[PDB]
Amino acid sequence: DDEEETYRLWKIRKTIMQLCHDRGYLVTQDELDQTLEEFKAQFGDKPSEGRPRRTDLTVLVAHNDDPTDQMFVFFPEEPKVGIKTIKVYCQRMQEENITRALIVVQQGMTPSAKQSLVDMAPKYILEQFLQQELLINITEHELVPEHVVMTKEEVTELLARYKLRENQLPRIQAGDPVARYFGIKRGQVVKIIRPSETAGRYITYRLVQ
Amino acid sequence: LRQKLLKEQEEKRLREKEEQKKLLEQRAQYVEKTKNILMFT
Numbered sequence: 033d034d035e036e037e038t039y040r041l042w043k044i045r046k047t048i049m050q051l052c053h054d055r056g057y058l059v060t061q062d063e064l065d066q067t068l069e070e071f072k073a074q075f076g077d078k079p080s081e082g083r084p085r086r087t088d089l090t091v092l093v094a095h096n097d098d099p100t101d102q103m104f105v106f107f108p109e110e111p112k113v114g115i116k117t118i119k120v121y122c123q124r125m126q127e128e129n130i131t132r133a134l135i136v137v138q139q140g141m142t143p144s145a146k147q148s149l150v151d152m153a154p155k156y157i158l159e160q161f162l163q164q165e166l167l168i169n170i171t172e173h174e175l176v177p178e179h180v181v182m183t184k185e186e187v188t189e190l191l192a193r194y195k196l197r198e199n200q201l202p203r204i205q206a207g208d209p210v211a212r213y214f215g216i217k218r219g220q221v222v223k224i225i226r227p228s229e230t231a232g233r234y235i236t237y238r239l240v241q
Numbered sequence: 242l243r244q245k246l247l248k249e250q251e252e253k254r255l256r257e258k259e260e261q262k263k264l265l266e267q268r269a270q271y272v273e274k275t276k277n278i279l280m281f282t
Contacts, residue, residue: 060268061261087282092275099271106282124282 037079041089041107042071043167044136048091048105050169055214057093057103085109092130104133111139118145125156135160159215170209177226179210182237187221190237204238216240 046066052059076083086107095101106121113135125133133156135141141160149158170176182190191198198219204211206218216222221239228234 060265088280090279092279094271128278
């Protein structure tokens with residue numbers, strides 16, 4: 033059972049590349065759509081006790097406007113990762129000058145380390161994802177419309193145009209897969225562009241709460 | 242019109258090829274830096 037795990041890690045890496053391209057971090061077209069064979073040749077086809085093991089396949093990227101804020105990901109070897117197996121990663125964070133990263137766990141994370149991710153959050157705004165969660169770019173689905181993250185200067189223009197307050201908008205909770213996909217804090221509004229069957233196109237605005 | 246269209250297409254080809262090469266070189270420099278700080282983690 034190594035073809036399936038290789039295919040699975042290939043789709044994970046591909047979805048992470050589309051994740052980092054949609055989020056804004058600079059990634060090239062070569063990594064954006066590679067086939068299975070570039071992955072197999074460049075990591076080594078043997079996920080069980082072989083060359084494409086975890087941790088030294090993990091991606092680090094940089095944002096497009098400046099190469100100062102940087103985004104790791106980390107794919108842990110453990111099925112259920114823990115505090116002692118994330119403080120290593122947080123040590124790599126504080127070792128660098130970087131701020132934040134992803135953790136794509138294999139099985140469900142332990143609750144204590146989830147509370148840990150909560151506690152050093154204002155220092156390091158890092159988050160997790162799941163393996164089963166990341167075998168599909170759910171943005172590509174037909175039900176999901178186009179989400180765009182608004183800049184604060186545009187949010188001010190929005191609230192000034194319609195003359196309304198920040199709590200009167202329709203809203204979205206921080207835990208749903210799209211806002212967790214882009215990765216956004218509360219107090220941050222999101223354009224949704226969707227096709228209308230009555231009049232063409234329609235834009236709306238969900239505020240993260 | 243033929244001359245104008247050929248000039249425009251050659252200009253767009255050169256511009257896109259140049260931009261892709263520059264982005265590849267930026268990514269390559271950052272690939273060296275992330276290799277240095279990634280191999281240890």
